[PDB]
């Protein structure tokens, strides 16, 4: 008669690694790394993403005439700029501090337009347009030009009483010739100033032909700033100014991401979203992407993190 102490053995093919040995057979193990995603762009706990398929963020902000669908304002969890989004600044020119602008914008979770300067306040023409801009112009600004061969000094003011910051835009036109400069502003030497209690910016035109872009030799330098609650914006110009028309009230905080992909979007909701797809899991890690955002596990760059649960699996035979 005898009594023996022993331990379990199974047909498990699970293995785990240790520092002093690898591929140790174990009776039970738990994979801690989640490696699957749904291959789609979905909504997160913060809502649906703002998917821009024809307009770039700055195109929307400046109101490129091809982005009218966005005029009513939106709210988002995150932003997606499809590679097809090519409508940004239709009229040749650059946006100063573009990265900061796009960052500031994407960080909010919504925008709502607000009129700063009504068309009536001007004593000069305000409906200038361009073929580079669908024979129209930006919905955020007005291309001021002479009326009746006169361009009196323009001096307008707007006080932010919305109790919320207003993102506003403006530009300075640089005609390709002195003739065009005069035909539009009545003078070759102008001065434009955009000011508030904090900023004090002034601009002067520099006539001359730049390389062709969208068929034009001229340019418009684009600028932006933020009128804080209570502050007063004031613009004075005797020519060359592309006046603020509508601004945006930014609110909330989103995931603050800008994904640049053509990944398919679907009618879905996930805890964690990445540019490759989303996922749901209770496992502590994942290897889908370091850019994951939302309610996520910790990203780790490996194929597996198998934790031993049972004991070393030793075959009797």
């Amino acid at each position: 008669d005898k009594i023996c102490i022993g331990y379990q053995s199974t047909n498990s093919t699970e293995t785990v690694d240790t520092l002093t040995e690898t591929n140790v057979p174990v009776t039970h193990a738990k994979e801690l790394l989640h490696t699957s995603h749904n291959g789609m762009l979905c909504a997160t706990n913060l809502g649906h993403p703002l998917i821009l398929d024809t307009c770039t963020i700055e195109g929307l902000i400046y109101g490129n005439p091809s982005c009218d669908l966005l005029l009513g304002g939106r709210e988002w969890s995150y932003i997606v700029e499809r590679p097809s989004a090519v409508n940004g600044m239709c009229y040749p020119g650059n946006v100063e501090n573009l990265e900061e602008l796009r960052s500031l914008f994407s960080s909010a979770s919504s925008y709502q337009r607000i009129q700063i300067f009504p068309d009536t306040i001007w004593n000069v023409s305000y409906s200038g347009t361009s073929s580079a801009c669908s024979d129209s112009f930006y919905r955020s600004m007005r291309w001021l030009t002479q009326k009746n061969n006169a361009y009196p000094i323009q001096d307008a003011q707007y006080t932010n009483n919305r109790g919320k910051s207003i993102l506003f835009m403006w530009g300075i036109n640089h005609p390709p010739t002195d003739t065009v400069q005069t035909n539009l502003y009545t003078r070759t030497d102008t001065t434009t100033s955009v000011t508030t209690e904090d900023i004090n910016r002034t601009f002067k035109p520099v006539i001359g032909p730049r390389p062709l872009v969208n068929g034009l030799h001229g340019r418009i330098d684009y600028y932006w700033s933020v009128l804080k609650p209570g502050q007063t914006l004031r613009v004075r110009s005797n020519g060359n100014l592309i006046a603020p028309w509508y601004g945006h009230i930014l609110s909330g905080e989103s995931h603050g991401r800008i994904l640049k992909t053509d990944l398919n979007s679907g009618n879905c909701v996930v805890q964690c979203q990445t540019e490759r797809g989303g996922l749901n899991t209770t496992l502590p890690f994942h290897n889908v992407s370091k850019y994951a955002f939302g309610n996520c596990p910790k990203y780790v760059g490996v194929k597996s993190l198998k934790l031993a649960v049972g004991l070393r699996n030793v075959p009797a035979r």
Binding site: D1, I5, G6, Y7
Partner: peptide
């Protein structure tokens, strides 16, 4: 204890007895 027991299905550790 050179090997495991495939017959121990309920848990990790156990006993095996031998009598009449």
């Amino acid at each position: 204890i050179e090997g495991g027991w495939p017959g121990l299905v309920a848990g990790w550790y156990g006993f095996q007895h031998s009598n009449d």
